[PDB]
Scaffold this active site. Structure first.
Site, mmCIF file in Angstrom:
data_model
loop_
_atom_site.group_PDB
_atom_site.id
_atom_site.type_symbol
_atom_site.label_atom_id
_atom_site.label_comp_id
_atom_site.label_asym_id
_atom_site.label_seq_id
_atom_site.Cartn_x
_atom_site.Cartn_y
_atom_site.Cartn_z
ATOM 1 N N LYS A 45 -6.696 -6.854 -1.919
ATOM 2 C CA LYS A 45 -6.472 -8.050 -2.695
ATOM 3 C C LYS A 45 -5.243 -8.803 -2.208
ATOM 4 C CE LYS A 45 -9.285 -6.539 -6.169
ATOM 5 N NZ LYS A 45 -10.693 -6.439 -5.754
ATOM 6 N N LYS A 54 0.795 -1.177 0.000
ATOM 7 C CA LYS A 54 0.000 0.000 0.000
ATOM 8 C C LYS A 54 0.839 1.241 0.000
ATOM 9 C CE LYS A 54 -3.891 2.543 1.025
ATOM 10 N NZ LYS A 54 -5.166 2.844 1.676
ATOM 11 N N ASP A 109 7.102 -18.212 -36.174
ATOM 12 C CA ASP A 109 6.728 -17.732 -37.461
ATOM 13 C C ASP A 109 7.970 -17.103 -37.984
ATOM 14 O OD1 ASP A 109 7.158 -15.388 -35.808
ATOM 15 O OD2 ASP A 109 5.396 -14.378 -36.717
ATOM 16 N N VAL A 163 -0.657 1.707 -5.685
ATOM 17 C CA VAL A 163 -1.343 0.758 -4.899
ATOM 18 C C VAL A 163 -2.301 1.459 -4.017
ATOM 19 C CG1 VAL A 163 -1.464 -1.390 -3.705
ATOM 20 C CG2 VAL A 163 0.298 -0.937 -5.402
ATOM 21 N N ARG A 189 5.157 -24.935 -32.887
ATOM 22 C CA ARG A 189 6.440 -24.243 -32.910
ATOM 23 C C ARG A 189 7.177 -24.479 -34.216
ATOM 24 N NH1 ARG A 189 7.838 -19.924 -30.186
ATOM 25 N NH2 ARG A 189 10.020 -20.594 -30.457
ATOM 26 N N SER A 223 14.471 -14.354 -33.113
ATOM 27 C CA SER A 223 15.061 -15.485 -32.345
ATOM 28 C C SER A 223 15.860 -16.551 -33.111
ATOM 29 C CB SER A 223 13.961 -16.250 -31.640
ATOM 30 O OG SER A 223 12.993 -16.669 -32.592
ATOM 31 N N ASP A 253 5.626 -13.402 -42.696
ATOM 32 C CA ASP A 253 5.678 -11.966 -42.832
ATOM 33 C C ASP A 253 6.968 -11.482 -43.461
ATOM 34 O OD1 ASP A 253 3.348 -12.022 -41.085
ATOM 35 O OD2 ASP A 253 4.328 -10.376 -39.824
ATOM 36 N N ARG A 289 19.156 -15.268 -33.954
ATOM 37 C CA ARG A 289 19.903 -15.342 -32.744
ATOM 38 C C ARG A 289 20.203 -16.797 -32.380
ATOM 39 N NH1 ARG A 289 16.151 -12.997 -28.366
ATOM 40 N NH2 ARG A 289 14.896 -14.077 -29.938
ATOM 41 N N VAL A 295 -7.615 -17.606 -31.974
ATOM 42 C CA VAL A 295 -7.876 -17.631 -33.383
ATOM 43 C C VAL A 295 -7.284 -16.409 -34.001
ATOM 44 C CG1 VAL A 295 -9.735 -17.083 -34.928
ATOM 45 C CG2 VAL A 295 -9.966 -18.938 -33.244
HETATM 46 NA NA NA Z 1 -6.236 -14.210 -30.959
HETATM 47 NI NI NI Z 2 7.678 -12.674 -37.747
#
Ligand code: NA
Ligand code: NI
Ligand code: NI
Length: 327
Positions: free
Chosen positions: A64, A52, A182, A57, A141, A172, A248, A175, A95
């Site tokens: 909580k 707090k 993707d 806060v 993946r 990634s 992409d 790297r 989706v």
């Molecule tokens: Na979505």
């Molecule tokens: Ni991408």
DNA sequence: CATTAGA
DNA sequence: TCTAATG
């Protein structure tokens, strides 16, 4: 990082829900700063009262926190977790093309599931439709093994079309990652930069190329500087077909590649840290350039870059292989 | 944080 | 035009 976990995780669980199942932009906005600041505090929140004292806060979150701390749960946390409508909202979200807004909409309509989604294919747009079609693959993946194959093909045609083409597969993968989600393809050409008023076709050429040979199979969104699709690896000599994989491609002024290259390559932290560095070193870095700092507070004037090195040299840093761009 | 779709 | 959704 671990002494305030349970606080930061529930709190985020808290944030996300208002954001999604509810339309509480602020509440949501509230839960996150706290979970942000309760994150930096170096000591074990032992009580609300304690918390707090924090910034952001208030009475609500603090209250909580006592509950979470006292009993190893939260009812608010337990009811929602349980709630079917809310559930569903989180699911439908999955989706690709599906956002909270639409997820809410499908829900009130009664569209909760996957099957419900199919049965009213009419109710979806292209995107969402595509996504619908490739939900299983979409979530899978990308083994680098494959990332390897993919990249191959793609620089291949890129080359084929015009030899003046510069493609680089960022993120990634770049790297070293044993796996990806993707492929991201950084694209540029000399014939396109800062001023040189486009050449939409530039992107255009190449997308066509890829389809032409069957690498590209769908279109999520095609623009003059940003394509977003799907892809697939020529399913071998049978018995094994490749899973649909997002994709992409992006065009860029050849005069701002490397920053973007550098940038998109991460890591988020690598970036953040390097950039932080540039600041001391009298510079400013961001997704498209590199400008030297003027004591007046700020300054501009984008320094010339020819490669990932230039940006390095500039902020007189050690060249770091993408492998080791982890942080 | 900017690009795209879409209604 | 604004609003959504991806990255
Ligand atoms: Na979505
Ligand atoms: Ni991408
Ligand atoms: Ni279509």
């Amino acid at each position: 990082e671990t002494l305030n976990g349970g606080i930061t995780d529930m709190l985020t669980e808290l944030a996300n829900f208002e954001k999604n199942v509810s339309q509480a932009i602020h509440k949501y906005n509230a839960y996150r700063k706290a979970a942000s600041v309760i994150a930096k505090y170096p000591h074990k929140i032992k009580s609300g009262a304690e918390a707090k004292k924090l910034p952001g806060v208030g009475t609500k979150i603090a209250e909580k926190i006592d509950e979470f701390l006292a009993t190893g749960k939260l009812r608010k946390l337990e009811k929602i977790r349980q709630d079917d409508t809310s559930s569903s909202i989180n699911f439908l979200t999955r989706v690709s093309g599906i956002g909270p807004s639409a997820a809410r909409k499908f829900v009130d309509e009664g569209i909760k599931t996957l099957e419900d989604l199919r049965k009213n294919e009419d109710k979806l747009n292209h995107h969402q439709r595509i996504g619908l079609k490739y939900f299983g693959d979409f979530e899978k993946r990308i083994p680098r093994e494959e990332m390897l194959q993919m990249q191959d093909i793609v620089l291949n045609e890129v080359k084929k079309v015009d030899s003046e083409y510069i493609a680089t597969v960022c993120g990634s993968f770049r790297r070293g990652a044993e796996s990806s989600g993707d492929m991201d393809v950084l694209l540029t050409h000399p014939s396109f930069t800062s001023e040189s008023t486009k050449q939409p076709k530039l992107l255009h050429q190449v997308v066509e190329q890829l389809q032409k040979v069957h690498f590209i199979t769908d279109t999520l969104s095609k623009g003059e500087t940003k394509f977003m699709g799907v892809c697939q690896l020529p399913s071998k000599n049978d018995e094994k077909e490749y899973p649909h994989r997002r994709i992409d491609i992006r065009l860029i002024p050849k005069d701002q590649y490397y920053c973007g290259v550098l940038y998109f390559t991460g890591s988020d932290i690598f970036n953040k840290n390097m950039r932080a560095h540039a600041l001391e070193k009298g510079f400013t870095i961001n997704e498209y350039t590199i400008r030297p700092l003027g004591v007046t507070g700020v300054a501009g004037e984008p320094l010339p870059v020819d490669s990932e090195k230039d940006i390095f040299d500039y902020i007189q840093w050690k060249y770091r292989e993408p492998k080791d761009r982890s942080e």
